[PDB]
């Protein structure tokens, strides 16, 4: 299934920026980093449970948040850009 | 129609934080700031065109980017959080 991962972390600190690097390291195994903290990923349901599980341990859950959008097929024909 | 807007800007400088707030002020007219630089928007075709126009002026096109994902209806049945 396609999954868009949007990670909200405060990059004004070294530790923030380091968690971003880890989250990115993890998500790019499963697809592509299209902005600094946005990822277009391709995962089986087992992989998705595994990813959730590892993301939990990387992120600071009190300050950070991750959202997952499950778009269908023809999701590429449904993205537009600027910049 | 529902559109997800994701804005990539560097917020370690005042100039980036300004641009983000300005994008925020615009996008919040049409939906919600679900995370610091992500906005879930509800828009007519005409609203979508005018917004795209103004975002274009606001952002630094060389160092920033905006992605608009058109969410299908019942897109809410397909969002999860950790």
Automatic annotation (TrEMBL), chain B:
Single GO biological process annotation from the record: defense response to virus
Molecular function terms, GO-annotated: hydrolase activity; metal ion binding; RNA endonuclease activity
Nuclease in keyword set: yes
Domain of life: Bacteria
EC annotation from Swiss-Prot or TrEMBL: 3.1.-.-
Keywords linked to the UniProt accession: Antiviral defense, Endonuclease, Hydrolase, Magnesium, Metal-binding, Nuclease
Record family assignment: Belongs to the CRISPR-associated endoribonuclease Cas2 protein family.
Name of protein: CRISPR-associated endoribonuclease Cas2
Full-sequence portion shown in this chain: 1 to 82 of 97
């Amino acid at each position: 299934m396609m999954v868009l991962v949007t990670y909200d972390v405060n990059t004004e600190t070294p530790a923030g920026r380091k968690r971003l690097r880890h989250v990115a390291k993890l998500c790019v195994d499963y697809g592509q980093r299209v902005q600094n903290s946005v990822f277009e990923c391709s995962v089986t349901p087992a992989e998705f449970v595994d990813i959730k599980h590892r993301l939990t341990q990387i992120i600071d859950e009190k300050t950070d948040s991750i959202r997952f959008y499950l778009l269908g097929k023809n999701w590429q024909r449904r993205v537009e850009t600027l910049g």
